[PDB]
Amino acid sequence: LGGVDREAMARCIEECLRCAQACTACADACLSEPAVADLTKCIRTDMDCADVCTATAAVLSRHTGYDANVTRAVLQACATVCAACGDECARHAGMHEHCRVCAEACRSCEQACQELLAGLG
Amino acid sequence: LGGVDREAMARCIEECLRCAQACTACADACLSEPAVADLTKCIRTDMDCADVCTATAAVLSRHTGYDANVTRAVLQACATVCAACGDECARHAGMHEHCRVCAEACRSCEQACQELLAGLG
Amino acid sequence: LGGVDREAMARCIEECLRCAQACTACADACLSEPAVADLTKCIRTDMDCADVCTATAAVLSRHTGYDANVTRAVLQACATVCAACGDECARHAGMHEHCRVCAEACRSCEQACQELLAGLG
Amino acid sequence: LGGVDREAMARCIEECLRCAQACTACADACLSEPAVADLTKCIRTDMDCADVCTATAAVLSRHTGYDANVTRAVLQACATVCAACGDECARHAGMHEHCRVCAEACRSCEQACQELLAGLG
Ligand SMILES: [Cu+]
Ligand SMILES: [Cu+]
Ligand SMILES: [Cu+]
Ligand SMILES: [Cu+]
Ligand SMILES: [Cu+]
Ligand SMILES: [Cu+]
Ligand SMILES: [Cu+]
Ligand SMILES: [Cu+]
Ligand SMILES: [Cu+]
Ligand SMILES: [Cu+]
Ligand SMILES: [Cu+]
Ligand SMILES: [Cu+]
Ligand SMILES: [Cu+]
Ligand SMILES: [Cu+]
Ligand SMILES: [Cu+]
Ligand SMILES: [Cu+]
Ligand SMILES: [Cu+]
Ligand SMILES: [Cu+]
Ligand SMILES: [Cu+]
Ligand SMILES: [Cu+]
Ligand SMILES: [Cu+]
Ligand SMILES: [Cu+]
Ligand SMILES: [Cu+]
Ligand SMILES: [Cu+]
Ligand SMILES: [Cu+]
Ligand SMILES: [Cu+]
Ligand SMILES: [Cu+]
Ligand SMILES: [Cu+]
Ligand SMILES: [Cu+]
Ligand SMILES: [Cu+]
Ligand SMILES: [Cu+]
Ligand SMILES: [Cu+]
Ligand SMILES: [Cu+]
Ligand SMILES: [Cu+]
Ligand SMILES: [Cu+]
Ligand SMILES: [Cu+]
Ligand SMILES: [Cu+]
Ligand SMILES: [Cu+]
Ligand SMILES: [Cu+]
Ligand SMILES: [Cu+]
Ligand SMILES: [Cu+]
Ligand SMILES: [Cu+]
Ligand SMILES: [Cu+]
Ligand SMILES: [Cu+]
Ligand SMILES: [Cu+]
Ligand SMILES: [Cu+]
Ligand SMILES: [Cu+]
Ligand SMILES: [Cu+]
Ligand SMILES: [Cu+]
Ligand SMILES: [Cu+]
Ligand SMILES: [Cu+]
Ligand SMILES: [Cu+]
Ligand SMILES: [Cu+]
Ligand SMILES: [Cu+]
Ligand SMILES: [Cu+]
Ligand SMILES: [Cu+]
Ligand SMILES: [Cu+]
Ligand SMILES: [Cu+]
Ligand SMILES: [Cu+]
Ligand SMILES: [Cu+]
Ligand SMILES: [Cu+]
Ligand SMILES: [Cu+]
Ligand SMILES: [Cu+]
Ligand SMILES: [Cu+]
Ligand SMILES: [Cu+]
Ligand SMILES: [Cu+]
Ligand SMILES: [Cu+]
Ligand SMILES: [Cu+]
Ligand SMILES: [Cu+]
Ligand SMILES: [Cu+]
Ligand SMILES: [Cu+]
Ligand SMILES: [Cu+]
Ligand SMILES: [Cu+]
Ligand SMILES: [Cu+]
Ligand SMILES: [Cu+]
Ligand SMILES: [Cu+]
Ligand SMILES: [Cu+]
Ligand SMILES: [Cu+]
Ligand SMILES: [Cu+]
Ligand SMILES: [Cu+]
């Protein structure tokens, strides 16, 4: 905060919550496929991307005693995992609608994290 | 799942994520008030309501090997905490806009949990 | 708090953290089995039991403006899910060491939750 | 995984769970001090360090489709926040025992993250 883009922050928080949920729902949807054995990296990466988006949403929602070093590090982590997860689910976009929808959510939240991170100094 | 209201489920998941975030933001907004000393139960209850809504959103987002006993217990917990937190922040609705907004989110998600729980058998 | 068993509380918090981790590790260990297709309810229940134990540990770690109604509801949820997950992984105790170890952690934390819940009035 | 130090990994997971809990307990203990108004950055940083340690413990507990890029990014975030939080609570080590205990937990988990991160390539 201070010279930050408040609208870029709100987008990042909203995209994190959306993306955590998409990833949780994708993990579960894949567990239910008969194809489950071939979708285990996707499921694992989804579990991670949901955990990190959850944490990132909470970190970014707070302004008291804001420390840009913590914020940048957390946004970096979230961008890195959303990129990994985006590609991972994108692999199954032609197999399952859940994975193409989740791939879009990862990429969208990767963009939101990157956009915010850049304007943090 | 099975005879469940899919739209009541989606509302519950959306309201949980909205409410977790509102509560996290309220906790932080109160930490920043000069009035902080008088707002410590509100801050604590917000932290709890954010933790439980987070968990509830994730539990309700999953359908593989669904167990209605776990689901009902988790929805019960989330309703109970949203009721407690709703009243707690509602106390400061005439002091801070963050608390009146958060009070509405708690009550809204309390309703969503109760509505879903009722149709689970 | 007030007439509560402080040692029963500490056990509950410690068992929750242990159990969240055991469940996360079990979920992942099962995703890696060649048997994964037959272990999907176990994996799902593990994900839920890790989420609820995480939340319960945090709720129980807090004493400011303690509300026994929220605490009991949250402990109830955690006991219910640990019971479900205990039985679920116990099914694979003769197939995988991870599931027999995780089954013991669920049962242990089910006991800790039940013991605490009983002395809360 | 592969050329990784399995004992450094277990330490990191254990220290994260310990540290998440210490931070949650410190946040709450500070909310209860009469001194609360002067301890608001400590409380905020504790909330963040608990969220990130929670996520890090879960990420590090998983081996299926392991991606060292995600793992390093997440460990980096966790080290950065534990360093920030260590110093933040260390400021009140002569005021409250909870803050000196929590400061030690942050520093300990900062070390565990840094040690692991270094051997990941
Ligand atoms: Cu975000
Ligand atoms: Cu995200
Ligand atoms: Cu996601
Ligand atoms: Cu999926
Ligand atoms: Cu998948
Ligand atoms: Cu994902
Ligand atoms: Cu994510
Ligand atoms: Cu994120
Ligand atoms: Cu992300
Ligand atoms: Cu993904
Ligand atoms: Cu996929
Ligand atoms: Cu996926
Ligand atoms: Cu999917
Ligand atoms: Cu898929
Ligand atoms: Cu995704
Ligand atoms: Cu995904
Ligand atoms: Cu993602
Ligand atoms: Cu994402
Ligand atoms: Cu993001
Ligand atoms: Cu972001
Ligand atoms: Cu909900
Ligand atoms: Cu909620
Ligand atoms: Cu809320
Ligand atoms: Cu507030
Ligand atoms: Cu408040
Ligand atoms: Cu709340
Ligand atoms: Cu809530
Ligand atoms: Cu909820
Ligand atoms: Cu709730
Ligand atoms: Cu509230
Ligand atoms: Cu309030
Ligand atoms: Cu509040
Ligand atoms: Cu507020
Ligand atoms: Cu307020
Ligand atoms: Cu609220
Ligand atoms: Cu609130
Ligand atoms: Cu609430
Ligand atoms: Cu709520
Ligand atoms: Cu709700
Ligand atoms: Cu709900
Ligand atoms: Cu517990
Ligand atoms: Cu537990
Ligand atoms: Cu467990
Ligand atoms: Cu397992
Ligand atoms: Cu399993
Ligand atoms: Cu479990
Ligand atoms: Cu559990
Ligand atoms: Cu628990
Ligand atoms: Cu439990
Ligand atoms: Cu289990
Ligand atoms: Cu199992
Ligand atoms: Cu299991
Ligand atoms: Cu297992
Ligand atoms: Cu197993
Ligand atoms: Cu278990
Ligand atoms: Cu288990
Ligand atoms: Cu369990
Ligand atoms: Cu458990
Ligand atoms: Cu328990
Ligand atoms: Cu417990
Ligand atoms: Cu760790
Ligand atoms: Cu940590
Ligand atoms: Cu900590
Ligand atoms: Cu503290
Ligand atoms: Cu503090
Ligand atoms: Cu901390
Ligand atoms: Cu931490
Ligand atoms: Cu950590
Ligand atoms: Cu850390
Ligand atoms: Cu700290
Ligand atoms: Cu402190
Ligand atoms: Cu602290
Ligand atoms: Cu403290
Ligand atoms: Cu202190
Ligand atoms: Cu600490
Ligand atoms: Cu601390
Ligand atoms: Cu810390
Ligand atoms: Cu830490
Ligand atoms: Cu650490
Ligand atoms: Cu670590």
Describe the structure.
Four copies of one chain form a homotetramer. Chain A has 121 residues and is mainly α. In chain A, 77% of the residues lie in helices and 0% in strands. Chain A has one domain (1-121). Chain A is built from four helices and no strands. In chain A, helix 1 (6-32) runs antiparallel to helix 4 (97-118) and helix 2 (40-60) packs antiparallel against helix 3 (68-90). The longest helix of chain A has 27 residues, at 6-32. Chain A is elongated and about 50 Å long. Chains in contact: A-B, A-C, A-D, B-C, B-D, C-D. The A-C interface holds A 27-28, 31-32, 34, 36-37, 40, 43-44, 47 and C 27-28, 31-32, 34, 36-37, 40, 43-44, 47. The structure holds copper (I) ion (CU1) (80 copies). One copper (I) ion binds next to helix 1 and helix 3 of chain A. One copper (I) ion (CU1) is lined by residues 19, 49, 53, 82, 85, 106, 109 of chain A.
Topology of this structure?
Four copies of one chain form a homotetramer.
Chain A: H1 6-32, H2 40-60, H3 68-90, H4 97-118
Helix pairs in contact in A: 1-2, 1-4, 2-3, 3-4
Give the helix/strand class of chain A.
Answer: mainly alpha
> Share of helix among residues of chain A?
over 70%
Q: How many angstroms separate the termini of chain A?
A: 11 Å
Supply Rg of chain A: 15 Å
Largest sheet of chain A: none
PDB class: metal binding protein
Keywords: Copper storage, cytocolic, metal binding protein
Assembly: tetrameric
Entry title: Cytosolic copper storage protein Csp from Streptomyces lividans: Cu loaded form
What would you say about this model in short?
4 copies of one chain form a homotetramer. Chain A has 121 residues and is mainly α.
